[PDB]
Scaffold this active site. Structure first.
Site, PDB file in Angstrom:
ATOM      1  CG  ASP A 646      33.461  -0.376  24.668  1.00 22.78           C
ATOM      2  OD1 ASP A 646      31.953  -0.639  24.613  1.00 22.78           O
ATOM      3  OD2 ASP A 646      34.684   0.331  25.218  1.00 22.78           O
ATOM      4  CD  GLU A 675      29.047   2.217  23.219  1.00 23.20           C
ATOM      5  OE1 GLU A 675      28.573   1.955  23.749  1.00 23.20           O
ATOM      6  OE2 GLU A 675      30.403   1.538  23.169  1.00 23.20           O
TER       7      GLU A 675
END
Ligand SMILES: OC[C@H]1O[C@@H]2O[C@H]3[C@H](O)[C@@H](O)[C@@H](O[C@H]4[C@H](O)[C@@H](O)[C@@H](O[C@H]5[C@H](O)[C@@H](O)[C@@H](O[C@H]6[C@H](O)[C@@H](O)[C@@H](O[C@H]7[C@H](O)[C@@H](O)[C@@H](O[C@H]8[C@H](O)[C@@H](O)[C@@H](O[C@H]1[C@H](O)[C@H]2O)O[C@@H]8CO)O[C@@H]7CO)O[C@@H]6CO)O[C@@H]5CO)O[C@@H]4CO)O[C@@H]3CO
Ligand SMILES: OC[C@H]1O[C@@H]2O[C@H]3[C@H](O)[C@@H](O)[C@@H](O[C@H]4[C@H](O)[C@@H](O)[C@@H](O[C@H]5[C@H](O)[C@@H](O)[C@@H](O[C@H]6[C@H](O)[C@@H](O)[C@@H](O[C@H]7[C@H](O)[C@@H](O)[C@@H](O[C@H]8[C@H](O)[C@@H](O)[C@@H](O[C@H]1[C@H](O)[C@H]2O)O[C@@H]8CO)O[C@@H]7CO)O[C@@H]6CO)O[C@@H]5CO)O[C@@H]4CO)O[C@@H]3CO
Ligand SMILES: [Ca+2]
Ligand SMILES: [Ca+2]
Ligand SMILES: [Ca+2]
Ligand SMILES: [Ca+2]
Ligand SMILES: [Ca+2]
Length: 1052
Positions: A646, A675
């Site tokens: 994340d 990400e």
């Protein structure tokens, strides 16, 4: 040595107090409080004006050149102004001046709401409004901020003392460095003389290299200064204090301790002789290990042994401590509170927890008691060894409650639990088995580490399947709510939410209203809220007290691998913690080593929140080690096949790469991705971004194909949600009533889509929207280079994900009124085909095969079972179940109301058709190695496109994959080439690019018959192909007795 001291003058009182219809502003003349000259205030004036924000002035003079609002009076501390008022509530607008020059370069807003006596002080060169002159006086001649940075043993970066005669590192073991009763700073100290930043310090903290540098004696006892408060202090030659600030010490802590501390192992560790406890706490004055009974009574307390090399604390005890509950009783200075704090903290290296994570628990993860039968031989059902292994990865991003909370065919006690995946006859598991057999390869699990935002005490929780009265028992805001009458109703919350659908509208958003309260006390959250990084979540266990969740988690993992046939990926969230400071229940890391594990503002020392929450510091060595040790457990002890980071862009590239090599030493096939947006942390280190991760093998989500196919971007709102059509929803070929997309814009989206279907490589060469040769990196994407990767395995393509609107909801925002329900189902499959038939790793949200809807909810992390529902009984797709929550989608209610009811809501017939479409797409993806070449250079030599350039048939995507000799060997014995044709258009289209060859429709699609995405495709004798509107066709040239000519890529 000169004694550093306060001004030789008192702490000021208030000069005047305002009366009725009055306010008073003091300007505290710091420099003239250093007296010398009795300074003149004739030129001081205030500029005062009313606007719509602050309007409480009676006679404001708007002439900026008017400097006649001079002080009402003055004393030794400065002037003051008495300002008449029309009212005693609200606020006034103030600029403080000398002549026309501002002495505070900021519109001041003095609120009578925050300052009740309307008598405030300000200082030149500072925007803060203080309640009294003493407050402002102490601000100027007291500790403030934290801009000094002790970054290694001998160097201290600080601006507040550059070119000042006296500059000094004071320290107090047990109290706050406050001037003594003689206004003197008489605490112990170290002496700093200006110096030049190391070349290794600037290379370590480049966002600080422009800080004025200072040196410490080559013999300071850092161990002792770091035991308490440190305050860097400066002043002038007389000794009157100039400034004083707190010190950030993560730099020195790493220089001093990290080399030694990295060699140790941490947490409660079972050895052959017993249990060894070890926590890293280099600044703690004491660490006491507190042992608890199962009833949480203290049964022992052990002062721990400090190792002065590492700053780690250890204690060794008997093997009978296995199973025992424990906390670390800390005595440690916390710079936020400026107190030596005393509190008990769970283990940051905890591997077992009590209910709600209140106590950590000693555990041996290797105990066969914590293992399902057969665990030690559980194997990876899908290879991840080569790049062609990795490219085959087809991810199904899921959530523990989203999977099973609604499935009546899951036993009631397993709903929303890890063990629902063992319910072999449930609709959910049978459906996942169907997806696996058709070519979904990986389950990705939203947070199943210990999250903070669900109460694991079930008695404090009410879920919508339970009586509405239980909701009132546990949520005391409901009695005060307009739903209070339902407490008596004898009906469940689910029944009430349903009944509320009837009169729900953008004018009466009542379903969302009840659900916002439900959200506060239910079992639902995405869980991006880390409490403990290396323990499973408790609320997903049938029993959250103790080690039960460990065996239940592993039983789920085994069921997924062994019964369902999929690999498992974990979402991990090492970029932030749930809380920080010495107060909050979920602050763990920042209670034990304050200000080390969090990223701080270089000036205030405040914990940053750019991730959402409490930003962490993976650039610091012991957090880097914590992350790596944590991943090692998930890899080895829980057999996790890969990790999705994340907000990976908030981590250093070097730290991610380091972690990856550590984990590859445990399992070579482990796969990392995340990400990789822009974190705004490039000033501190090379971030782990899409751009900087080129060639590393670290995957990243590509927003390129995503936005081209969906339309728009994740920050669209209002009409833009409908105007911004994508390739999947008919951009430029089936426009809706609002859009102004041009043919050029639509052709640009097709460029991005083709680019992403070839793996979004920076160096891939195609023909763009204008007929021009472009490199992958030369296609613009919002200004950035579009292609950014070296191999397709570094790119994760998708058109739907847990965050932002579902694909179905985007199609509903964007589809023209004339697209009927069947056409929208084909828009969904066409959108997903760009992902499933592309060279990038394929990623999708759970339920896309069921047209999953969230009732237009764009950020559903806390929207509960109701909006996140996925119906494996296949009755509907959860569309049109109420207006989404107004706090985040309220500014979309208008556009939602206009588009919502264009067509009927998907029912069982549409869901089965979408599921067949979806399985057909995934079967096609694994039907040939040609779809998943793995290597970037192999893609470049085999992947081409037809129907390109300025007169392309808009929306028709035609990709060729060469398996003939001008690219290399025949990876596929069956075919000499593959043609992928996605006709995202309302017109039927004919291909002549392959006339004369033996082209024929793939057998998978021929077998699906009337249900195929290619139903009605025609291949003529001469090899011309006719494609229906809104279709996907996979064509092949059958292979002859040697490798033929295939479909040679052209050199452009
Ligand atoms: O209508 C335009 C304007 O409307 C709104 O502003 C209102 C505001 O919210 C109210 O509070 C009040 O404004 C008062 C303001 O808050 C005070 O700060 C003060 O203004 C003085 C300045 O503090 C002082 O520094 C100086 O300002 C000079 C500038 O330093 C100088 O740069 C130049 O200004 C020119 C700019 O370079 C140029 O950008 C352009 O300004 C335009 C703005 O950029 C643009 O945002 C918009 O402004 C809106 C604003 O968004 C709303 O909040 O249009 C502007 C006009 O073109 O041109 C500038 C000059 O043409 O010169 C100035 C002047 O010396 O002195 C000022 C003295 O006024 O007092 C303000 C008035 O009490 O009212 C406004 C509405 O009237
Ligand atoms: O942190 C607050 C934010 O958190 C969440 O957003 C997440 C989001 O859900 C994820 O998708 C991802 O976002 C990344 C995205 O996926 C990538 O593509 C890229 O984003 C680029 C865009 O693709 C590109 O379009 C462009 O963005 C421009 C916008 O198009 C344009 O509209 C404008 O943006 C302004 C907005 O209009 C305005 O509303 C305001 O935005 C604020 C939101 O209103 C508010 O909800 C919140 O956003 C949350 C969000 O709800 C969570 O889901 O704060 C927003 C401000 O941060 O202001 C915008 C101006 O800043 O202009 C931009 C260009 O400036 O470029 C972007 C940037 O590369 O990277 C994204 C990473 O940020 O992750 C995020 C974060 O978790
Ligand atoms: Ca006051
Ligand atoms: Ca938890
Ligand atoms: Ca919730
Ligand atoms: Ca920053
Ligand atoms: Ca071949």
């Amino acid at each position: 040595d000169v004694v550093v001291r306060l001004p030789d003058v008192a702490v000021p009182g208030e000069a005047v107090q305002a009366s009725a219809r009055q306010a008073v502003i003091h300007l505290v003349d710091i420099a003239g409080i250093t007296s010398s000259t009795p300074a003149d205030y004739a030129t001081k004036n205030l500029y005062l004006w009313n606007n719509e924000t602050c309007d409480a002035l009676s006679a404001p003079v708007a002439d900026w050149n008017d400097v006649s609002t001079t002080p009402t009076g003055s004393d030794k501390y400065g002037p003051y102004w008495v300002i008449p008022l029309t009212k005693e509530s609200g606020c006034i607008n103030v600029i403080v001046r000398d002549g026309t020059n501002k002495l505070i370069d900021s519109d001041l807003r003095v609120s009578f709401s925050d300052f009740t006596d309307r008598t405030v002080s300000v200082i030149a060169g500072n925007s803060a409004v203080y309640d009294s002159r003493a407050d402002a006086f102490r601000a100027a001649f007291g500790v403030a901020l934290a801009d000094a940075h002790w970054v290694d043993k001998t160097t201290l970066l600080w601006p507040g003392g550059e070119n000042k005669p006296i500059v000094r590192l004071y320290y107090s073991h047990s109290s706050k460095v406050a001037a003594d009763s003689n206004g003197e700073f008489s605490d112990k100290y170290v002496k700093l003389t200006p110096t030049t930043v190391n070349q290794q310090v600037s290379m370590r903290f480049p966002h600080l290299a422009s800080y004025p540098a200072f040196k410490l004696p080559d013999d300071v006892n850092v161990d002792e200064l770091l035991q308490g408060e440190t305050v860097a202090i400066a002043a002038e030659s007389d000794g009157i204090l100039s400034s004083a600030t707190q010190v950030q010490t993560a730099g020195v802590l790493d220089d001093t301790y990290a080399a030694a501390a990295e060699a140790l192992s941490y947490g409660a560790q079972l050895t052959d002789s017993g249990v060894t406890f070890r926590v890293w706490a280099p600044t703690a004055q004491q660490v006491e290990l507190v042992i608890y009974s199962a009833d949480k009574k203290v049964i022992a307390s052990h002062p721990m042994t400090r190792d002065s090399a590492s700053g780690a604390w250890s204690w060794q005890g008997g093997s009978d401590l296995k199973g025992a509950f424990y906390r670390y009783a800390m005595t440690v200075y916390h710079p936020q509170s400026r107190k030596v704090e005393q509190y008990e903290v769970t283990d940051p290296y905890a591997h077992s927890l009590s209910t709600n994570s209140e106590y950590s628990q000693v555990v041996d993860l290797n105990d066969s008691a914590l293992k399902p039968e057969g665990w030690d031989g559980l194997t990876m059902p899908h290879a991840q060894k080569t790049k062609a292994d990795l490219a085959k990865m087809t991810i199904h991003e899921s959530h523990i409650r989203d999977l099973s909370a609604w499935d009546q065919t899951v036993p009631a006690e397993l709903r929303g639990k890890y063990l629902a995946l063992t319910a072999q006859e449930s609709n959910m598991v049978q459906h996942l088995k169907q997806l696996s057999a058709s070519g979904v390869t990986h389950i990705e699990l939203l947070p199943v580490f210990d999250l903070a935002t669900v109460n694991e005490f079930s008695d404090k929780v009410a879920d919508i399947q339970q009586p509405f009265s239980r909701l009132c028992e546990v949520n005391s805001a409901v009695k005060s709510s307009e739903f209070a009458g339902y407490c008596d109703s004898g009906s469940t919350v689910e029944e009430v939410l349903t009944q509320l659908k009837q009169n729900d509208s953008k004018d009466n958003p009542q379903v969302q209203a009840l659900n916002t309260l439900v959200a506060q006390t239910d079992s639902y959250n995405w869980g991006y809220d880390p409490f403990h990084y290396t323990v499973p979540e408790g609320s997903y266990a049938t029993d959250p007290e103790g080690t039960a969740r460990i065996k239940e988690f592993r039983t789920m993992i085994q069921a997924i691998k062994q019964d369902l046939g999929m690999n498992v990926i974990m979402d991990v969230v090492y970029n932030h913690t749930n809380a920080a400071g010495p107060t909050d229940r979920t602050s763990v890391l920042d209670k034990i080593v304050p200000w080390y594990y969090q990223r701080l503002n270089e000036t205030t020392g405040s914990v940053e929140s750019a991730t959402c929450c409490s930003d962490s510091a993976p650039e610091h060595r012991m957090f880097a080690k914590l992350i790596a040790d944590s991943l090692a457990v998930w890899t080895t002890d829980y057999k996790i096949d890969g990790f999705r980071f994340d907000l990976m862009l908030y981590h250093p590239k070097a730290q991610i790469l380091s972690a990856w090599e550590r984990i590859k030493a445990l399992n070579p096939d482990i796969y990392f991705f995340g990400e990789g947006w822009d974190s705004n942390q490039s000033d501190r280190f090379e971030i782990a971004s899409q751009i900087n991760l080129k060639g590393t093998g670290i995957g990243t989500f590509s927003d390129r194909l995503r936005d081209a196919v969906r339309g728009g971007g994740p920050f669209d709102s209002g009409d833009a949600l409908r105007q911004n059509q994508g390739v999947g929803s008919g951009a430029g070929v089936l426009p809706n009533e609002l859009t102004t997309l041009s043919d050029d814009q639509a052709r640009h989206l097709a460029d991005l889509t083709r680019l992403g279907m070839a793996g979004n490589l920076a160096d891939f060469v195609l023909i763009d929207k204008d007929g021009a040769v472009k490199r992958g990196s030369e296609i613009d994407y919002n200004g950035a280079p579009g292609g950014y990767a070296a191999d397709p395995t570094e790119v994760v393509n998708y058109v739907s994900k847990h965050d932002n609107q579902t694909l179905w909801d985007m199609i509903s925002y964007k589809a023209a009124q004339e697209a009927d329900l069947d056409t929208r189902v084909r828009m969904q499959a066409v959108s997903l085909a760009t992902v499933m038939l592309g060279q990038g790793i394929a990623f999708d949200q759970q339920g896309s095969e069921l047209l999953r809807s969230k009732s237009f909810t764009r950020d559903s992390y806390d929207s509960g079972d109701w909006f996140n529902r996925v119906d494996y009984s296949l009755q509907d797709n959860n569309y049109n179940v109420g207006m989404p929550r107004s706090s985040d989608d309220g500014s979309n209610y208008d556009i939602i109301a206009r588009v919502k009811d264009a067509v009927a809501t998907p029912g069982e017939t549409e869901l089965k058709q979408m599921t067949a479409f979806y399985q057909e797409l995934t079967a096609l993806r694994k039907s040939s190695p040609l779809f998943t070449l793995g290597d970037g250079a192999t893609v470049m030599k085999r992947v081409d496109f037809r129907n390109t350039g300025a007169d392309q048939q808009t929306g028709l995507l035609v990709m060729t994959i060469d398996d003939g000799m001008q690219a290399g060997a025949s990876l596929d014995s069956r075919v000499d080439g593959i043609v992928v044709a996605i006709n995202a258009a309302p017109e039927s289209r004919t291909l002549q690019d392959f006339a004369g060859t033996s082209l024929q429709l793939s057998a998978i699609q021929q077998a699906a018959g009337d249900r195929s995405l290619a139903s009605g495709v025609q291949v003529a004798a001469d090899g011309s192909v006719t494609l229906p509107a809104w279709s996907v066709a996979v064509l092949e040239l059958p292979q002859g007795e040697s490798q033929g000519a295939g479909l040679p890529v052209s050199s452009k």
